[PDB]
């Protein structure tokens, strides 16, 4: 299963890709809004793991991009972000995120939530 990992802090992104590799996934990297848009293409990701605060546009705006395009609107998105306030968790979910995980995170819970979401398609 391919996972688009969207995260601008390169050492965190690489750590996340390692956890995912070790858990059976094939991650692909995007470091900002525009890279995520461009990287979002064939071969399609099975899921998009998405930071909120990114150069060039937020992950909220990215979900709006995904959901506006009939070709991408069914691709699951799980947010993984330092924005932990209730208002933000609700905002992410309501925009279209299938789940929303806050930093710092447990690598076991991260993988468990991704696989839970993947079970639901």
Helix (H) or strand (E) segment spanning residue 3: strand 2-6
Pairwise CA distance, residues 1 & 118, whole Å? 9
Interface with a second copy (CB under 8 A), residue total: 21
Pairwise CA distance, residues 36 & 30, whole Å? 5
Q: Tokens for 65?
A: 């991009």
**40 burial via Cβ count (<10 Å: 0-12, 13-18, 19+):** buried
- For a second copy, which stretch binds (CB under 8 A), given 16-24, 31-39, 49-57, 85-93? 85-93
Q: Does 46 bind Mg ion (CB under 5 A)?
A: no
Q: Does 31 bind Mg ion (CB under 5 A)?
A: no
Q: Which of 83, 89, 91, 113 binds ligand BEF (CB under 6 A)?
A: 83
What residues make contact with a second copy under the rule CB under 8 A? 76, 86, 89-90, 93-94, 96-99, 106, 108-109, 112-113, 115-117, 119-121
What residues make contact with Mg ion under the rule CB under 5 A? 8, 51, 53
């Amino acid at each position: 299963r391919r996972i688009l990992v969207v995260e601008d802090e390169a050492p965190i992104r690489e750590m996340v890709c390692f956890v995912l590799e070790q858990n059976g996934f094939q991650p692909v990297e995007a470091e900002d809004y525009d890279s995520a848009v461009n990287q979002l293409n064939e071969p399609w990701p099975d899921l998009i793991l998405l930071d909120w605060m990114l150069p060039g546009g937020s992950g909220i705006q990215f979900i709006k991009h995904l959901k506006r395009e009939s070709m991408t609107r069914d691709i699951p998105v799980v947010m993984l972000t330092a924005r932990g306030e209730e208002e933000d968790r609700v905002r992410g979910l309501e925009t279209g995120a299938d789940d929303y995980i806050t930093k710092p995170f447990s690598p076991k819970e991260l993988v468990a939530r991704i696989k839970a979401v993947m079970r639901r398609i």
